[PDB]
């Protein structure tokens, strides 16, 4: 069956790591990119490579790849991860504690908003 | 050119640490074999043994050599290395490197009268490496190292001058015999004689002091 070897996949993470935004989703343009940015000893290997690299591209778009990150995705992750809400804790109705934990509050030097369970 | 990959080698290559005891003092784990190479030239290495052992292919046989190496100045610093190689003088080299990595501080002492610089040992100490167990006893001046040639040579390079020994177990398994004579003369600095009862402040550690001159870009 058609299971791509490591020499192929290795060089797929390689091109994606580096030249990500220069890459595409279409076989034919990448297939040409591989000739500029990289040296590959035979067209079929080059094609095999270029073909897996693009398969990856087509699925990196629909969510990140389990072991692959690059510049523009790292930026993408920083932003979207820095979401801050309207706070939560806050408090929306005092502090809801049971007892003993109250005894912990009292036996400490603290007033706080009351509640017993 | 030595290009240190660890924080420690950096602070060594810089002349920022001048003594090995500095490393011991802080129990800093040494990893680059050049650290000791610089911290301690004039460190002779001795070839103990090179007996071949054998295994199998997915069928038959396996030839490979087992080199045993002792490194030591002759002054409180000794190492022990054991390596196997596909080659001969390959393991030998590799062993030495592995030996220096093991270089340990020796607490020589006085048999009695503290006249004119230590000769024997602090105390009776003993080590054990699976079955073989060696035990060294402080000795009068003129006694000398009373041990089986191998163990003795390890003790010469160790910096010991006079000491009594007593073996136990299969002392014919040389590799095991030495590794315990090693464990033995390395356990000296572990023993709480009343001198060290004295209170100390504990130094700051060259890893925090020269911390700037330590880390990478």
């Amino acid at each position: 069956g058609r299971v791509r070897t490591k020499t192929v996949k290795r060089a797929s993470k390689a091109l994606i790591e580096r030249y990500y935004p220069k890459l595409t989703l279409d076989f034919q343009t990448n297939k040409r990119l591989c000739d500029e940015i990289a040296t590959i000893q035979s067209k079929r290997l080059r094609n095999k490579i270029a073909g897996y690299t693009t398969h990856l591209m087509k699925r990196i778009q629909k969510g990140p790849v389990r072991g692959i990150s690059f510049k523009l995705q790292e930026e993408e992750r920083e932003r979207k991860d820095q979401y801050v809400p309207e706070v939560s804790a806050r408090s929306n109705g005092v502090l809801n504690v049971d007892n003993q934990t109250s005894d912990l509050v009292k036996s400490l030097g603290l007033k706080l908003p009351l509640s017993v369970i | 050119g030595w290009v240190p990959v660890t924080k420690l080698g950096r602070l060594v290559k810089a002349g920022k640490i001048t003594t090995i005891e500095e490393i011991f003092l802080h129990s800093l784990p040494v990893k680059e074999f050049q650290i000791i190479d610089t911290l301690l030239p004039g460190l002779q290495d001795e070839v103990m043994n090179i007996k071949p052992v054998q295994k199998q292919t997915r069928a038959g046989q396996r030839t490979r050599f087992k080199a045993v190496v002792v490194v030591g100045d002759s002054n409180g610093h000794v190492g022990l290395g054991i390596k196997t190689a596909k080659e001969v003088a390959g393991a030998i080299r590799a062993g030495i490197i592995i030996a220096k990595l093991s270089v340990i501080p020796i607490r020589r002492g006085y048999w009695g009268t503290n006249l004119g610089q230590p000769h024997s040992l602090a105390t009776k100490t003993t080590g054990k490496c699976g079955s073989v167990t060696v035990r060294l006893i402080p000795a009068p001046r003129g006694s000398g190292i009373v041990a089986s040639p191998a163990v003795k040579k390890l003790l010469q390079l160790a910096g010991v001058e006079d000491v009594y020994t007593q073996s136990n177990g299969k002392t014919r398994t040389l590799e095991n015999t030495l590794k315990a004579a090693f464990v033995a003369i390395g356990n000296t600095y572990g023993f709480l004689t009343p001198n060290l009862w004295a209170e100390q402040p504990l130094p700051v550690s060259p890893l925090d002091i020269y911390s700037d001159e330590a880390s990478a870009q």
């Binding site: - | 610089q117 709480l192 060290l196 100390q200 504990l202």
Partner: protein, 87 residues
């Protein structure tokens, strides 16, 4: 270690653990050295200057490295009401 004429022989004098007074071996690579910051007039941690304990491998391996360490802080002031002798 002295000698004939009192001169300080013996290559090096080893640290002693601060929870068991037990010598820190040159190969005791689970032996740890904590460095805690002294704080000047409110807030600002004084750089360069530490309150420092040393905890040996054996204490740490047996998991005593927190309780023991805690007693040590509370008794150099660094803690209030956490450790408690009588238990």
């Amino acid at each position: 270690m002295e000698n004939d004429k009192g001169q300080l022989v013996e290559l090096y004098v080893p640290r002693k653990c601060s929870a068991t007074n037990r010598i820190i071996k040159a190969d005791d690579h689970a032996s740890v050295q904590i460095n805690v910051a002294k704080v000047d007039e409110e807030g600002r941690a004084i750089p360069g200057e530490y309150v420092t304990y040393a905890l040996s491998g054996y204490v740490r391996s047996r998991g005593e490295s927190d309780d023991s360490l805690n007693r040590l802080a509370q008794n150099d002031g660094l803690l209030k009401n956490v450790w408690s002798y009588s238990r």
